[PDB]
From Swiss-Prot, chain A:
Disulfide bond residue pairs: none
Role played: Fatty acid synthetase catalyzes the formation of long-chain fatty acids from acetyl-CoA, malonyl-CoA and NADPH. The alpha subunit contains domains for: acyl carrier protein, 3-oxoacyl-[acyl-carrier-protein] reductase, and 3-oxoacyl-[acyl-carrier-protein] synthase.
Record note on quaternary structure: [Alpha(6)beta(6)] hexamers of two multifunctional subunits (alpha and beta).
Segment of the intact protein contained: 775 to 919 of 1885
Source organism, top-level taxon: Eukaryota
Protein name listed in UniProt: Fatty acid synthase subunit alpha
Coiled coil residues, start to end: none
Record-stated family: Belongs to the thiolase-like superfamily. Fungal fatty acid synthetase subunit alpha family.
Swiss-Prot record, chain B:
Domain of life of the organism encoding this protein: Eukaryota
Gene expressing this chain: FAS1
Segment of the intact protein contained: 1657 to 1719 of 2037
Family: Belongs to the fungal fatty acid synthetase subunit beta family.
Disulfide cysteine pairs (residue numbers): none
Subunit structure: [Alpha(6)beta(6)] hexamers of two multifunctional subunits (alpha and beta).
Function, in words: Fatty acid synthetase catalyzes the formation of long-chain fatty acids from acetyl-CoA, malonyl-CoA and NADPH. The beta subunit contains domains for: [acyl-carrier-protein] acetyltransferase and malonyltransferase, S-acyl fatty acid synthase thioesterase, enoyl-[acyl-carrier-protein] reductase, and 3-hydroxypalmitoyl-[acyl-carrier-protein] dehydratase.
Record-given protein name: Fatty acid synthase subunit beta
């Protein structure tokens, strides 16, 4: 769950940016914690597929998007340090250049130029295939470990 | 021959030692076999699903 916030720098962290940060980080962690609180057993964990980003402020003027995405990376350490390792299992998918999405719809035209250096840009179906690859039984066991 | 629902639960609620016996048994069952014998006795469900996810669940599966 993300809302589109754009043009918001450090000097314009506005109500939209604060609300977006709530959605992407605060209420996200609250949703995970609520699922944990309502899990009765320790033998059926939930695999949380976290939409991590590789660009933590590299483009800028994205409001608090980078803050939310990098804050999601603390769950990897908190899996060990807290009592919810057996209830939730963290699978952080650092999603790359996805084509057709609003976050990079303005950069579809430069997707080819990006790819020209031997780099891969993804369509929505390809991204879905890759993230569904994180739900295979082997990766599920790996997340549980 | 006699396995009626809720047998021994009066003693379970009244005596600390019966509580200890049932609690030890239920904890062992939950940890090593994935079910609660107290739940089985109190509720008598028709079907019960055991889940083998996680490290404890895989230990239960190996059991």
């Amino acid at each position: 769950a993300a809302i589109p916030e754009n043009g918001n720098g450090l000097d314009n962290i506005d109500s939209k940016s604060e609300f977006a940060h709530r959605i992407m980080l605060t209420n996200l962690l609250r949703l995970l914690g609520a699922v944990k609180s309502k899990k009765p057993t320790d033998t059926r964990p939930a695999q949380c597929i976290l939409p991590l980003s590789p660009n933590h402020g590299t483009f800028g003027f994205d409001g608090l998007y980078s803050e939310s995405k990098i804050s999601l990376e603390t769950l990897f350490n908190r899996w060990y340090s807290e009592d919810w390792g057996s209830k939730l299992t963290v699978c952080g998918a650092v999603i790359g250049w996805t084509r057709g999405t609003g976050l990079m719809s303005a950069n579809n035209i430069i997707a080819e130029g990006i790819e020209k250096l031997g780099v891969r840009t993804f369509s929505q179906k390809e991204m879905a295939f890759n993230i569904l690859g994180l739900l295979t039984p082997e990766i599920v066991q790996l997340c549980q470990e | 021959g006699s396995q009626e629902q809720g047998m021994g639960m009066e003693l379970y609620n009244s005596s600390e030692v019966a509580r200890e016996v049932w609690d030890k048994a239920d904890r062992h069952f939950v940890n090593n076999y994935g079910f609660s014998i107290l739940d089985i006795v109190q509720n008598n469900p028709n079907e019960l699903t055991i889940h083998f996810g996680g490290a404890k669940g895989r230990a239960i599966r190996d059991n």
